[PDB]
Amino acid sequence: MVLYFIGLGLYDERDITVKGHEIAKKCDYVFAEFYTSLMAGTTLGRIQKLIGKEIRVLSREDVELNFENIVLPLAKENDVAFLTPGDPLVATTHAELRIRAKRAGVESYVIHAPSIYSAVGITGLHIYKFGKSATVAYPEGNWFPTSYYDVIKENAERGLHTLLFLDIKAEKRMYMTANEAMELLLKVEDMKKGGVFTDDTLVVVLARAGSLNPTIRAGYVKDLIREDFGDPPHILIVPGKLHIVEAEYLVEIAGAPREILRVNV
């Protein structure tokens, strides 16, 4: 009678850890949500087949409003698993769900899995150099979010890299592309004119991290804003001041313009 928060990883069903696999296999009931992120290389059936269990998929409302009515009750009798893409407690509000479990007298355990937060290392940018992170959100009616623009500015002034998660509207099967994120950022620049994100800004796009052949591209906005980076999900990164080895990697591995090799220390 316990609850397991189990991460499924970045791209397909094999991104789950062996630990999560073996534990998930032995749970009595298995729940999951697929709205916090997109696992582009697998399907529910493949995940179900891998753990040999039928998976009840929950919506954001089920989780956020009814977690303790749908999931917790069964944990007070059986071993329950709650699966999520990536790492269960990263860039989500899932940690709070552990507080709910505790208050219901249910013990919970966390099984981590690869997360985009660390997978950014494949871009060649030193992970310790990443500053505050943010999310580029889709404008809604008259509401046009812009906070993420200030995050980039703050990090950039400190010479730190900025990780930008991209919006997702799972119910409409909408996944923001790096292209759309760049368009939105240029518009915010026009509005704020802080010289933070322009046609000459160097950016890095990582698409489908976790797959064997993710798309890793670096370059100036003017050249990438209309480039095809393949299917979602995508994440956008605005590097801060680069170390020489970072620039070298971006050029040799991400096909960046050879001119960025010339860092202005």
Ligand X SMILES: Nc1ncnc2c1ncn2[C@@H]1O[C@H](CSCC[C@H](N)C(=O)O)[C@@H](O)[C@H]1O
**Chain positions contacting a second copy, by CB under 8 A:** 7, 9-10, 12-19, 21-22, 50, 86-96, 98-99, 102-103, 109-115, 117-119, 121-122, 124, 126-135, 154, 158, 160, 165, 209-210, 212-213, 245-246, 248-249, 252-253
Residue 93 CB burial class (10 angstroms; 0-12, 13-18, ≥19) = exposed
Site string for ligand X, 21-60 (x = CB under 6 A): ---------------xx-----------------------
- Alpha-carbon span 200 to 197, nearest angstrom: 8
In sequence order, the 6+-apart residues with CB closer than 8 A to the CB of 71 are 3, 31, 58, 80, 82
The verdict on 130 binding Na ion (CB under 5 A) reads yes
Of 112, 105, 85, nearest to 232 by C-alpha is: 85
Residue 13's binding partner out of Na ion, ligand X, a second copy, none, with CB under 5 to 8 Å set by partner kind = a second copy
Q: Which is nearer to a second copy, 90 or 225 (CB)?
A: 90
Q: Judged by CB, which is closer to ligand X: 165, or 197? A: 165
Q: Does 115 bind ligand X (CB under 6 A)?
A: yes
Report the alpha-carbon distance of residue 60 to residue 69 in Å, rounded: 14
Structure token pair of residue 42: 């697998």
For the CB of residue 205, give the shortest distance to a second copy in the complex, in Å: 16
Q: Tell me whether residue 157 or residue 199 sits nearer to a second copy (CB atom).
A: 157
Q: Is 44 in contact with 55 (CB distance < 8 Å)?
A: yes
Q: Would the annotation count 23 as a binding residue?
A: no
Q: Is 3 marked within a binding site?
A: no
Instruction: Classify 88 as helix, strand or coil.
Output: coil
87 is in an annotated binding site: yes
- In this structure, the strands spanning 202-207 and 162-166 are unpaired
Residue 249 CB, shortest distance to a second copy, in Å, is 5
Can you tell me which of 163, 206, 242, 254 binds ligand X, judged by CB under 6 A?
A: 206
> What's the number of CA atoms in the CB half-sphere (13 Å) around residue 7?
22
Q: How far is the CB of 116 from Na ion (least distance, A)?
A: 11
Q: How far lies 201's CA from each of 158, 165, 236, in Å?
A: 16, 18, 12
Candidate segments 16-24, 68-76, 102-110, 165-173, binder of ligand X by CB under 6 A: 165-173
Which tokens hold the place of 6?
């189990």
- Judged by the rule CB under 5 A, the positions of this chain that interact with Na ion are 130
